Design a protein around this nucleic acid. Structure first.
Ligand SMILES: [K+]
Ligand SMILES: [Mn+2]
Ligand SMILES: [Mn+2]
Ligand SMILES: [Mn+2]
Ligand SMILES: [Mn+2]
Ligand SMILES: [Mn+2]
Ligand SMILES: [Mn+2]
Length: 136
RNA sequence: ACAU
DNA sequence: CGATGT
């Protein structure tokens, strides 16, 4: 209903899907970019959305921040809740890096705690999430 | 049919 | 038009 402006917004960007994947996190209130991941040569939209949320969790935890995270990805929100990224992406030499990062993110979720609410950004009501890459 |  | 996901 109401945007929680005191929050962190995250999003993936890509060149192809599967394709080159990156993500960033921004202050929802200001749009200030708070972190940006260096592009990974091959991944999927959903793996990147998942990595972005998990990085957000770690970023807020390290800073002792109780802000919620917004993501526009129903899939990634569920994967974080399950602590399991059920990606269909083939595991081969080309996808090894993204799969390592995904597996390491899952490992972090299974060894750490957090209270951070992970909220759905309601794109149909509010427009593009503030971390969007402007490519659609 | 909904979310990317 | 193509793809990734529940
Ligand atoms: K969107
Ligand atoms: Mn997104
Ligand atoms: Mn795994
Ligand atoms: Mn976007
Ligand atoms: Mn368009
Ligand atoms: Mn887009
Ligand atoms: Mn389009």
């Amino acid at each position: 209903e109401e945007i929680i402006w005191e929050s962190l917004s995250v999003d993936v960007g890509s060149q192809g899907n599967p394709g080159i994947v990156e993500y960033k996190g921004v202050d929802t209130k200001t749009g200030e970019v708070l972190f940006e991941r260096e592009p990974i040569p091959i991944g999927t939209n959903n793996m990147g959305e998942f990595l972005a949320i998990v990085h957000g969790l770690r970023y807020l935890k390290e800073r002792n921040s109780r802000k919620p995270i917004y993501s526009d990805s129903q899939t990634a929100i569920k994967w974080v809740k399950d602590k399991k990224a059920k990606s269909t992406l083939v595991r081969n030499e080309e996808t090894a890096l993204i799969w390592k990062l995904v597996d390491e993110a899952e490992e972090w979720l299974n060894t750490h705690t957090y209270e951070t609410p992970i909220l759905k950004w309601q794109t149909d009501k509010w427009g593009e999430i503030k971390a969007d890459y402007g490519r659609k």
